[PDB]
């Protein structure tokens, strides 16, 4: 089907044509062992699911209805940062400790500057293969990025 041949010729053109160095830094992905370790670490700090968020909302509402210290009784949150604009904003502050970058973002231009800005600010970063793997821990179809501003001791 014409879309199949179109995507195949697009991949063949991406392979055959010469590429500027700023592109093709993707596909030098982190090794599967360190990537699996990074995902095993990130899995502990997945963003709260909406059901757990509603449960925490009911808990804080029951606390305010009778207890004191409104909105303070809950423990400090601990979840990976994932918003692309939020992730770029965490850099150059600089609260970010790490910045994952998907290699397969559909607009290649959206993330080509991320490694360079990370090298400029010195924040650690790596290009894990697959945006979908970054999104599975995010509770979203795709996130294209991940970061950890804070972590348990």
């Amino acid at each position: 089907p014409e879309y199949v041949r179109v995507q195949r010729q697009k991949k063949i053109l991406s392979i055959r044509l010469k590429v500027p160095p700023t592109i093709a830094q993707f596909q030098y992905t982190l090794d599967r062992n360190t990537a699996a370790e990074t995902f095993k670490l990130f899995n502990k700090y997945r963003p709260e699911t909406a059901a757990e968020k509603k449960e925490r909302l009911t808990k804080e509402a029951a606390a305010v209805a009778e207890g004191k210290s409104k909105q303070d009784a809950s423990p400090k949150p601990y979840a990976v940062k994932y918003g692309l604009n939020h992730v770029v904003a965490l850099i150059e502050n600089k609260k970010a400790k790490l910045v994952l970058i998907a290699n397969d973002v559909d607009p290649i231009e959206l993330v080509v500057f991320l490694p360079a800005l990370c090298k400029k600010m010195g924040v650690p970063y790596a290009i894990v293969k697959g945006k979908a793997r970054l999104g599975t821990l995010v509770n979203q179809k795709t996130s294209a990025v991940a970061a950890l501003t804070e972590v348990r001791a």
């Binding site: 179109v6 010729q9 697009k10 053109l13 991406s14 044509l17 010469k18 590429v19 500027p20 700023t22 592109i23 692309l84 604009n85 939020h86 770029v88 904003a89 559909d106 607009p107 290649i108 231009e109 959206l110 080509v112 500057f113 800005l117």
Partner: protein, 203 residues
């Protein structure tokens, strides 16, 4: 965030990175149909500054249109008139080609109301564009008063009337003495200045 980074990277069209991405994109579009719905915009910052949200009821339509001077639709190039009709192939098609692409995407998506469009690519035989669109019928647009203005019947087919910013540029609508011929519509000012007012008590 990425706003200014992409906004500056788009300006470096001559850079080898954009230089190669534009060729890959023009090839991928040439393989595709002259009119097709892009799944997502290739320049999110441009649509974001053109008023597009990323929410239901918004739509994007990649489009393609042939470059070149308008050809007069007469057999054999016959003048059937005074010689002064120089350059039968030289007609410049007063309306901008982007307005033609907007009219085409609106004819394909006439239920949708065209809002804005932006250059994404071009070749020797074509000038690509990615007109954005919104559906008035969607409840998300009818609510959120900021985007509900399109639902008004007067806003129908804004591209056909030139109300689109490319159409407002082709119309010459701008303040200043330079635009006095079309500061408020060329035909309107022409009919107004040509009017022979005659009060019941002649002046």
């Amino acid at each position: 965030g990425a706003y200014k980074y992409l906004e500056e990277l788009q300006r470096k069209k001559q850079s080898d990175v954009l230089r190669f991405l534009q060729r890959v994109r023009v090839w991928e579009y040439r393989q595709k149909n002259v009119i097709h719905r892009a799944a997502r915009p290739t320049r999110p910052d441009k649509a974001r500054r053109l008023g597009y949200k990323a929410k239901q009821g918004f739509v994007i339509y990649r489009v393609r249109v042939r470059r070149g001077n308008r050809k007069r639709p007469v057999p054999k190039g016959a003048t059937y008139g005074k010689p002064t009709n120089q350059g039968v192939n030289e007609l410049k098609y007063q309306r901008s080609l982007r307005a033609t692409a907007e009219e085409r995407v609106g004819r394909r998506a006439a239920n949708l109301r065209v809002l804005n469009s932006y250059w994404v690519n071009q070749d020797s035989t074509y000038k690509y564009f990615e007109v954005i669109l919104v559906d008035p019928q969607h409840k998300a647009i009818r609510r959120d008063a900021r985007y509900n203005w399109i639902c008004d019947p007067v806003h129908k087919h804004r591209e056909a009337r030139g109300l689109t910013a490319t159409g407002k540029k082709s119309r010459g609508i701008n303040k200043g003495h330079k635009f006095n011929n079309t500061k408020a519509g060329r035909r309107k000012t022409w009919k107004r200045q040509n009017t022979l007012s005659l009060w019941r008590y002649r002046k």
